Design a protein around this ligand. Structure first.
Ligand SMILES: Nc1ncnc2c1ncn2[C@@H]1O[C@H](COP(=O)(O)OP(=O)(O)O)[C@@H](O)[C@H]1O
Ligand SMILES: Nc1ncnc2c1ncn2[C@@H]1O[C@H](COP(=O)(O)OP(=O)(O)O)[C@@H](O)[C@H]1O
Ligand SMILES: CC(=O)N[C@@H](CCC(=O)O)C(=O)O
Ligand SMILES: [Cl-]
Ligand SMILES: [K+]
Ligand SMILES: [K+]
Ligand SMILES: [K+]
Ligand SMILES: [K+]
Ligand SMILES: [K+]
Ligand SMILES: [Mg+2]
Ligand SMILES: [Mg+2]
Ligand SMILES: [Mg+2]
Ligand code: NI
Length: 1422
């Protein structure tokens, strides 16, 4: 394929691939930061003579429209002039393949027809930074054998080259005569005039209009130095010097011509204004507007008498408008007709027409919109902020991140802050730093406790928009009850009224109907009977979605009556109102993040295109940013609707809005608005570098957007809409294999436990990184499943495609491979074909590479493979090499990635921060590598067993390094984390946590070292590979980490040290297994799974009736210098992470503690530990056995650290980098710190209702999704507070009890106790006979499998529904007889929303604790 260069006059040269007309051309090189509307854009007459450099790296997605179709006025239907006006085009990536309902050909074919050169494959960012602020960069697209000289088209009057040669009329017959002086007018100026009643006489630029009859005159244009248009400047001057008073309205060139006619100077700007995100302020009334501009000359701000500036540019203070003080003459420097751009200043046409109609020398100011809000700063001295509580599916760490930004904002403005969050693992809840509240309460986020806090703290402000639905619902309940009014607590930001209007689906409908906005046929109902009615009126299929919820709780598609019955019943256990709505499954799902301040300035900060269509929850969807398959008309229609809706709803702060867009028309539906920070705002903040929560919080104090700094640029405001010169992809992470009852299908109700975000400058690059980030077993986009699972032999590939699931991406790969047409895949998946083209490109590269080897693969091919996201591992498998070999081969050809900044403005202004990503699609680095900082690796996506605790550890380490004056480099790919907030470190790489990429970054920075022990499993598993590739690992040697993860070495070490452990053995045979299990007695663990009977694999003696103890510790040179021991409530057999933890220990013998300590002393020494680690122990009397050792921070490190008032990670970080440490006050083995006056309890969080049909029962594999912790004078109090913090609700009614027979001896007393506390008891058959035989009264109930077979017995479903039963106790074990029946009982409780207890110890402790406050850690530490 044919190449060509872009050559600039300063020597820069870049080789591109030609996609336009293969011929050379010379002009002024410029750049424009607008991301969409390339077809409209390239037909702008302002680009005459110019070589355009596109910020958007991905160009051509929608091909080109009908370029010959006219409208009924005789103007181009889809374009802004009669043809392409750029002399040439420069992009990074060209989509040869396109997909849009209005596309009639590729953009390259269009370019070829119009004889316009175009090349792709050039670093448009580098170009931009070179052009930036040089006034005039000349360049040329030069083809081989076609030399051209540099030329400056500005030496010509370009106005004349693009003006009409004779007078043309549009709106023939219309009442209002408007002369339009054509200086390169865009078509939409004409459309907007005619639509308002004008007959438009379009006249050449040198036409003598001065004695013509007209009712108004307009002057519009784009290209050229206006000073070269003397005939015209003269003519306009004659008008101004006369007595004529016809309103005059100037656009862009018009501003400059009119200024010149009046007597002002113009100048060529060194930094032009070219974009769709250019902020202007109306001087007069302080209203701000986002504008499209495309001008390189500007008016000097010194104007003659009678003329005043109207608009100013908020970035650079240049003029953007003028007005006469008494006559109806005005001009704007920007394009209110946009196309492309934001439809925010179209009112200027209405204003013009009002000047004509009033016609008595009315003034420009008198007909301009008056401010609808006047931002007065709210006075607040103390604010309460609410957290989400424990993490759960759909309500994850995004709020830790948001709420930390909010506190920072509050502190900057001298506002005292109180935080409530029982999530002890949150970074939010730390004591130290600019993001930490002055006071922290670890308590339930429920009205009972928030009231107590309010009373005690007497705050005057409340932030309820940064804790998900928990905080929202709590705040609305407080409001409804008048608690806020009662204690004088103002809701800061969006009002409870606006909130209710977005959370109640009916009120939402009412609001949008008030402004005749577009929604789908629907009815909000409050009963199952009413839902059935609604569905019959609307017609099946229908979607139901709940009020006062997020993440699709209780939602679902209903193809029929019976599905609707099942789902609405379940929905009503969790909300009071559902919306029953006509299905728009398959429409494109589009999100916007919207900001609105108290001055009524309102912008869309980000927009996201969901790759999975409507019907798969945004949260369980692949999502790209910015959008890729919208037209300017689509994108701007939805943007402007967002702004209207958000305005009408009274929202002040930030919010998220969702649309369904018809895939082949302009039809759309507004689905919901989330008037609060969200998982979507977190993502958008990371994608754009715009900190939405920080901004939201400043706005909540009445500071308007123009007065808030863009911290990234350091020189501009937050009144703008970022420009991305890269694309981000977010993919969810699911963990479903362990929940046997739950399918891996996905739909309207979230099931994902985490997410990743990758950045690239091609879809393919961004996309394959993001897939690798989700799980270490995923290599990129391949037709192979994760976890090395084989495809089923009974696979129905069409079914997989048509029914979304956690693995559909790979099923698409497979289908493309197996030669299914792209058209049929789009038809079944609903995924826009454009995205499918990219996927096919990826698989073609795989085919190509498979036919090559280390000798046969060329440099051109390798480079391309990397540019579309292939890792060295993927390549290695094609070539027949190892990964190391392939890395070597690549570097040998000097093919490496480049380091680029996110600056929010696609290089318009440089970044003062270093928020970074890495890409193969560039020709330079955006930063230096002189720091040689200390690298810290983060956790990756959250998943079960790996949550925000590992962000806590990482952030603690990052903060410790900063506090010690050390340069830091962070790598993490989780958008929800505070570790991926750029203000925490010197260099944040939002990047893959692969060996490949860490090596890339380490070696590129020449980092002084790397800390791999504070981000869980991912970084720790890289310890040895890193070691071997020249990386300096801080702390405990990777050789020691290997030794310790080697079960055989570890065990032999323990034998040497005389430290006990459970008998174990690795086996290959069933007979070895059975022999061993026989030799130690059943039960046995199996590697996870336990077995109790006869009816390679590691086997371990399962020790029954055993306590479990955690040792969390820090080593220095093999000595332990901080430690903490906690006891689980539950016996060994419940996994650590599902366990409830007590600190300090409660029932452990003092001799066992001594053994735990001695075993930890020896282990630390044997593995020369310098850093954090953990050891887990079985304890039975004085027998102390080691279960496992982890040579890294454990998930209980936050709990332990905060509880004991010592940052274990601060200590450990200082050890690892050789900083000094005073051990006097640390909890060494010799002087532990043991709380005397209080106890701490950590409880696990679960997400059973969202894991449809899952058996809510603890296995040896872990199931919890988060944690809370609370404190108390004793264990009962602390335990009750912890449990309430999980959502557990103390029963007020009857308790259902069903237990396996063997629990009877121990349970009798638990039951008597519950009875003596006054709880009416219900029980399953045998359990009820037994209780009554022991004089504990119980009412028997029927088994679910036997309902109707005995009329003396009530069904459990009915007793729950009736409200007779509001706690279920179900205690199965291995000898449970009625396995299914008891499963049904357990799942019934979950799906009815009543608490369920399935562990005996937890149940015992509960009973003891109900036998009988609002304090927190800081109380007890005093
Ligand atoms: N009318 C509909 N037809 C098909 N899918 C829908 C419809 N309405 C909503 N959805 C899907 O359900 C998801 C959840 O709906 P939403 O109204 O966003 O509730 P939540 O606040 O719980 O996320 C949406 O993102 C979308 O994928
Ligand atoms: N020998 C044993 N007897 C009884 N329970 C055990 C035994 N070993 C492990 N368990 C249980 O299984 C859980 C997981 O064991 P662990 O070795 O920590 O696995 P993981 O690799 O998932 O961390 C433990 O926390 C404990 O409750
Ligand atoms: C949970 C459990 O194991 N229940 C008992 C049933 C005892 C009863 O009849 O109440 C069982 O053996 O299935
Ligand atoms: Cl852990
Ligand atoms: K979606
Ligand atoms: K909502
Ligand atoms: K959303
Ligand atoms: K499953
Ligand atoms: K090969
Ligand atoms: Mg929502
Ligand atoms: Mg939603
Ligand atoms: Mg473990
Ligand atoms: Ni300007």
């Amino acid at each position: 394929a044919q190449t060509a260069h872009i050559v600039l006059e300063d020597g820069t040269k870049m080789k591109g691939y030609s996609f336009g007309h293969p011929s050379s051309v010379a002009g002024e090189v410029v750049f424009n930061t607008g991301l969409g509307g390339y077809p409209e854009a390239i037909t702008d007459p302002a680009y005459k003579g110019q070589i355009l450099t596109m910020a958007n790296p991905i160009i051509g997605n929608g091909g080109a429209p009908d370029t010959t179709a006219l409208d009924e006025l005789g103007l181009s239907k889809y374009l802004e002039s009669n043809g392409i006006k750029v002399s040439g085009l420069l992009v990074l990536d060209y989509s040869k393949d396109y997909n849009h309902w209005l596309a009639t050909k590729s953009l390259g074919q269009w370019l070829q027809e119009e004889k316009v050169p175009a090349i792709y494959g050039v670093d448009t960012r580098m170009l931009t930074k070179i052009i930036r602020d040089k006034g005039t960069m000349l360049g040329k697209i030069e083809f081989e054998g076609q030399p051209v000289d540099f030329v400056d088209p500005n030496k010509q009057n370009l106005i004349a080259e693009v003006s009409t040669k004779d007078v043309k009329v549009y709106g023939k017959g219309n009442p209002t005569k408007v002369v339009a002086v054509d200086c390169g007018i865009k078509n939409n100026v004409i459309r907007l005039l005619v639509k308002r009643g004008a007959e438009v006489h379009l006249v050449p630029w040198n036409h003598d209009f001065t004695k013509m009859e007209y009712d108004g005159i307009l002057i519009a244009g784009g290209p050229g130095n206006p000073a070269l248009a003397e005939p015209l400047i003269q003519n306009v001057r004659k008008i101004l010097e006369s007595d004529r008073k016809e309103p005059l309205f100037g656009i862009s060139t018009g501003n400059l011509i009119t200024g010149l006619a009046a007597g002002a100077k113009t100048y060529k700007m060194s930094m032009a204004n070219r974009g769709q995100n250019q902020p202007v302020l109306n001087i007069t009334n302080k209203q701000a507007f986002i504008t499209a501009q495309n001008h390189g000359y500007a008016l000097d701000n010194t104007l003659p008498a009678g003329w005043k500036p109207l608009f100013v540019n908020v970035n650079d203070q240049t003029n953007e408008g003028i007005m006469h003080e008494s006559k109806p003459f005005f001009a704007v420097q920007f394009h209110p007709e946009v196309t492309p751009g934001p439809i925010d200043t179209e009112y200027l046409f209405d204003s013009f027409f009002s000047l004509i109609k009033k016609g008595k020398a009315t003034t420009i100011t008198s007909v301009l919109p008056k401010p609808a809000l006047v931002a007065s700063r709210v006075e607040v001295s103390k604010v309460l902020i609410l957290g989400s509580g424990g993490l759960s599916i759909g309500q994850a760490g995004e709020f830790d991140y948001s709420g930390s930004q909010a506190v920072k904002a509050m502190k900057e403005e001298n506002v005292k802050t109180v935080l409530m969050n029982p999530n002890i693992a949150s970074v939010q809840t730390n004591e130290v730093g600019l993001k930490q509240a002055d006071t922290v309460y670890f308590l339930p986020i429920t009205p009972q406790f928030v009231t107590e806090v309010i009373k005690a703290e007497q705050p005057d402000g409340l932030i309820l928009g940064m804790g998900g639905q928990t905080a929202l619902n709590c705040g609305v309940e407080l409001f409804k009850r008048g608690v806020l009014k009662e204690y004088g607590v103002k809701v800061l930001g969006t009002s409870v009224e606006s909130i209710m209007a977005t959370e109640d689906r009916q009120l939402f409908s009412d609001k949008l109907n008030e402004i005749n906005e577009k929604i789908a046929p629907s009815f909000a109902v409050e009963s199952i009977e009413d839902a059935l009615k609604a569905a019959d009126t609307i017609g099946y299929p229908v979607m139901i979605r709940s009020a006062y919820a997020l993440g699709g709780l209780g939602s679902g598609i209903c193809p029929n009556r019976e599905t609707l019955m099942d789902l609405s019943t379940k929905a009503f256990a969790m909300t009071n109102q559902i919306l029953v709505e006509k299905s728009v499954t398959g429409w494109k799902e589009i999100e916007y993040e919207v900001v609105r301040d108290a001055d009524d300035n309102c912008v869309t900060v980000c927009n996201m295109e969901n790759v999975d269509a409507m019907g798969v929850h945004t949260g369980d969807s692949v999502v790209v940013a910015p959008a890729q398959t919208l037209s300017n008309a689509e994108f701007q229609m939805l943007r402007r609707t967002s702004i209207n809706v958000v305005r009408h709803l009274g929202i002040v702060g930030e919010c998220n809005i969702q649309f369904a867009l018809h895939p082949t028309s302009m039809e759309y539906c507004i689905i919901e608005v989330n008037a609060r920070l969200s998982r979507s705002s977190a993502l958008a903040s990371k994608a754009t570098g715009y900190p939405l929560a920080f901004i939201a919080a400043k706005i909540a104090l009445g500071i308007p957007l123009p007065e808030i700094k863009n911290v990234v640029s350091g020189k501009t405001s937050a009144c703008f809409e970022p420009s991305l010169d890269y694309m981000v992809t977010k993919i969810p992470r699911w963990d479903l294999d362990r929940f046997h009852g739950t399918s891996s299908r996905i739909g309207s109700s979230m099931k994902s436990v985490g997410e990743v975000m990758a950045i690239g400058r091609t879809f393919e690059e961004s996309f394959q990184k993001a897939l690798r980030m989700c799980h270490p077993s995923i290599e990129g986009f391949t037709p192979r499943l994760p976890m090395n699972k084989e495809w089923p032999s009974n696979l129905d590939l069409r079914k997989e495609l048509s029914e979304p699931s956690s693995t559909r991406i790979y099923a698409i790969a497979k289908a493309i491979d197996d030669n299914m047409s792209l058209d049929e895949i789009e038809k079944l998946t609903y995924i826009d074909k454009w995205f499918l083209y990219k996927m096919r490109d990826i698989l073609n590269m795989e085919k190509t590479l498979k036919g090559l080897n280390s000798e046969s693969m060329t440099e051109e091919t390798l480079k391309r493979a990397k540019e579309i996201g292939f890792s060295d591992k993927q390549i290695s498998k094609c070539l027949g090499l190892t990964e190391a070999q392939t890395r070597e081969l690549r570097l040998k050809k000097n093919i490496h990635p480049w380091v680029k900044q996110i600056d929010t403005l696609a290089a318009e202004y440089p970044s003062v921060t270093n928020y970074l990503y890495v890409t193969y699609n560039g020709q330079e680095h955006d930063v230096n590598f002189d720091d040689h900082g200390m690298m810290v690796l983060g956790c990756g996506p959250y998943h079960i067993g790996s949550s925000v605790e590992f962000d806590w550890c990482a952030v603690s380490s990052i903060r410790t390094l900063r506090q010690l004056g050390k340069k830091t480099v962070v790598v993490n790919c989780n958008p929800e984390t505070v570790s991926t907030d750029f203000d925490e470190c010197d260099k944040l790489y939002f990047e893959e946590l692969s060996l490949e990429r860490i090596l890339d970054i380490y070696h590129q920075e020449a980092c002084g070292g790397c800390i791999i022990s504070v981000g869980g499993q991912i970084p720790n598993n890289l310890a040895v590979p890193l070691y071997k590739n020249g990386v300096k690992i801080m702390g405990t040697s990777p050789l020691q980490i290997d030794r310790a993860e080697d079960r055989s070495i570890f065990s032999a070490v323990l034998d040497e040290l005389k430290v006990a452990q459970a008998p174990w053995k690795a086996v290959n045979t069933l007979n070895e297994a059975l022999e061993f299990a026989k030799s130690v007695d059943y039960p046995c663990l199996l590697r996870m799974n336990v077995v109790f009977s006869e009816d390679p694999v590691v086997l371990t003696k399962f020790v029954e009736g055993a306590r479990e103890v955690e040792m969390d510790a820090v080593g220095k040179d093999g000595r332990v210098i901080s430690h903490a021991i906690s006891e689980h409530v539950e016996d060994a057999g419940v996994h650590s992470g599902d366990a409830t933890l007590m600190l300090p220990t409660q029932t452990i013998s003092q001799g066992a503690i001594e053994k735990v300590k001695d075993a930890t002393r020896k282990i630390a020494k044997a593995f020369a530990i310098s850093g954090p680690f953990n050891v887990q122990f079985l304890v039975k009397g004085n027998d102390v056995l080691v279960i496992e050792c982890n040579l890294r921070a454990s998930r209980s490190f936050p709990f332990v650290s905060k509880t004991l008032g010592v940052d274990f990670i601060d200590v450990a970080t200082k050890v690892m980098i050789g900083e000094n440490v005073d051990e006097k006050h640390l909890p060494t083995l010799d002087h532990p710190i043991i709380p005397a006056d209080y106890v701490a309890i950590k409880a696990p969080m679960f997400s059973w209702p969202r894991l449809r049909d899952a058996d809510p029962i603890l296995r040896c594999e872990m199931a919890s999704t988060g944690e809370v912790a609370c404190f108390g004078e004793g264990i009962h109090t602390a335990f009750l507070k912890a449990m309430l913090s999980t959502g557990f609700k103390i029963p007020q009614k009857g308790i259902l009890i069903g237990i396996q027979q063997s629990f009877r001896p121990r349970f009798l007393g638990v039951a008597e106790q519950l009875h003596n506390e006054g709880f009416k008891l219900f029980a399953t058959e045998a359990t009820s006979d037994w209780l009554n035989a022991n004089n504990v009264p119980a009412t028997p109930v029927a088994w679910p499998s036997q309902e109707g077979q005995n009329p003396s017995l009530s069904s459990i479903r009915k007793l729950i529904r009736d409200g007779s039963i509001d706690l279920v106790i179900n205690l199965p074990n291995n000898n449970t007889k009625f396995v299914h029946d008891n499963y049904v009982i357990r799942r019934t409780a979950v799906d009815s929303g009543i608490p369920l207890l399935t562990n005996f110890q937890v149940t015992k402790l509960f009973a003891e604790a109900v036998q009988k406050d609002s304090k927190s850690l800081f109380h007890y530490r005093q």
